[PDB]
């Protein structure tokens, strides 16, 4: 089967990290891996041409890269990339897609490699790290309601990787209700009884959302 | 009533911008005039090293005292309380603001809101909203469940308590409960006492690993 990368993306993906947009650092990590048959960057319509520009400026010409229009939410954007793949290449039952936040530039060769190998075997993969902090619940945002049990608790990161045909089948079954939220594709799989394989992420595999995150980002780099 | 700080503390000693992390943390508390005493709770092996570091970077301060800790961290909290009990006596309104020595980035607001909250409510936890998706797994191999995270928070420190009540609640616990209990606020939670929330900060991190120390210089 084929192996696709789907990088989900002023919008934070474009902010500078050591003089180059965060998204460029992220895309570079995928380009280093020879296993990808195509690497998609999925973007809102309003930002597609700027994304294409930034790629030619910092990366240059590479046949594997394509910028594709996203959708209404994150899972729709994953599906929009899958739609492009269907139209350009067709989808075969063994094809896999490695989806990943554009603003997580620090994922490693190991994380990418483990994701592909896990998804080829299991069909659904989440990249996670052990929760460092005690998790606390509060119903009123003012007092502790109850403090749950850390019986192995993890923080989700990304990449999240799937057998394409399987994700399509499960996503189509979502009533229009579920997917007005359900921002997490691994949740889609696990809610449906699929076994989602864990791959260990890294503490430095941070999502760069806020100005403080960017401060952390430059340090990590 | 009295207001005490208890800084629970080897990673504390590692250099942050050329000063041990513990010095950064202690300085945040020295800046607040409301503390009657500021305790640094340390394993017996490291009491001398701690006093030396304090003497070098802070110098003499009547409010600072290094106290021998205990078996685990909750026992270390209790050990600091026992010191207060012997040296000063305890009145029912006295409060203690407990805090990780490896968390140097807490702020004036965090400290002051902790004190004000404990004076009113008796028990306080410093927390931030859970941003990342939280996942459980029974086998550490596959996802078991992905809970909704409206309403979930990551616990930080300080955690502050009325001293006499914490002691009373701690000793109502079973050996079994004490064995696995890691969160001091649970001592109160389990007895059906309310624990007030104070908002922490994303940068109020623990600095424990070699990697962590670099996030720290950034901050």
From Swiss-Prot, chain B:
A Pfam family recorded for this sequence: IspD
> Which keywords appear in this protein's UniProt record, sorted alphabetically?
Cell wall biogenesis/degradation, Nucleotidyltransferase, Teichoic acid biosynthesis, Transferase
Annotated InterPro entries: IspD/TarI (IPR034683), IspD/TarI_cytidylyltransf_bact (IPR050088), ISPD_synthase_CS (IPR018294), Nucleotide-diphossugar_trans (IPR029044), TarI (IPR034709)
Pathway where this protein functions? Cell wall biogenesis; poly(ribitol phosphate) teichoic acid biosynthesis
| Gene Ontology biological process terms in this record | cell wall organization; isoprenoid biosynthetic process; poly(ribitol phosphate) teichoic acid biosynthetic process
Determine if Transferase is one of this entry's keywords.
yes
Task: Output the CDD domains linked to this UniProt entry.
Answer: CDP-ME_synthetase
Q: Which reaction does it catalyse?
A: D-ribitol 5-phosphate + CTP + H(+) = CDP-L-ribitol + diphosphate
Q: Which residues form the signal peptide?
A: none
Q: What is its EC number?
A: 2.7.7.40
Protein residues bound to CTP: 70-76, 101
Site (described: Transition state stabilizer): 11
Source organism superkingdom: Bacteria
Sites marked Positions ribitol 5-phosphate for the nucleophilic attack: 149, 206
Q: Which GO molecular function entries does the Swiss-Prot or TrEMBL record give?
A: 2-C-methyl-D-erythritol 4-phosphate cytidylyltransferase activity; D-ribitol-5-phosphate cytidylyltransferase activity
Q: What does this protein do?
A: Catalyzes the transfer of the cytidylyl group of CTP to D-ribitol 5-phosphate.
What family is reported?
Belongs to the IspD/TarI cytidylyltransferase family. TarI subfamily.
Q: Which PANTHER family match?
A: 2-C-METHYL-D-ERYTHRITOL 4-PHOSPHATE CYTIDYLYLTRANSFERASE, CHLOROPLASTIC, RIBITOL-5-PHOSPHATE CYTIDYLYLTRANSFERASE
Q: This chain belongs to which protein, by name? A: Ribitol-5-phosphate cytidylyltransferase
The organism encoding this protein is: Bacillus spizizenii (strain ATCC 23059 / NRRL B-14472 / W23)
């Amino acid at each position: 089967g084929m192996i696709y990368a789907e990088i989900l993306a002023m919008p934070k993906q474009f902010l500078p990290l050591n003089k180059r947009p965060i998204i460029i650092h992220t895309v570079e990590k995928f380009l280093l891996n020879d296993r990808f048959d195509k690497i998609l960057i999925v973007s809102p319509k309003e930002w597609i041409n700027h994304t294409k520009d930034i790629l030619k400026k910092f990366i240059g010409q590479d046949d594997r890269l394509v910028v594709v229009e996203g959708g209404s939410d994150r899972n729709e954007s994953i599906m929009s990339g899958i739609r492009y793949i269907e139209k350009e290449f067709g989808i075969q039952d063994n094809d896999v897609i490695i989806t990943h936040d554009s603003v997580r530039p620090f994922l490693t060769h190991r994380i990418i490699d483990e994701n592909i190998d896990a998804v080829l075997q299991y069909g659904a993969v989440d990249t996670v790290i052990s929760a460092i902090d005690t998790i606390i619940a509060s119903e009123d945002q003012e007092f502790i309601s109850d403090i749950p049990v850390r019986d192995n608790m993890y923080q989700g990161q990304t990449p999240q990787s799937f057998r394409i045909s399987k994700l399509v089948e499960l996503y189509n079954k979502l009533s229009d209700e579920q997917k007005a939220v359900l921002t997490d594709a691994c949740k889609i799989c696990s809610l449906a009884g699929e076994k989602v394989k864990l791959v260990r992420g890294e503490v430095f595999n941070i999502k760069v959302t806020t100005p403080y995150d960017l401060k952390v980002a430059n340090a990590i780099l």
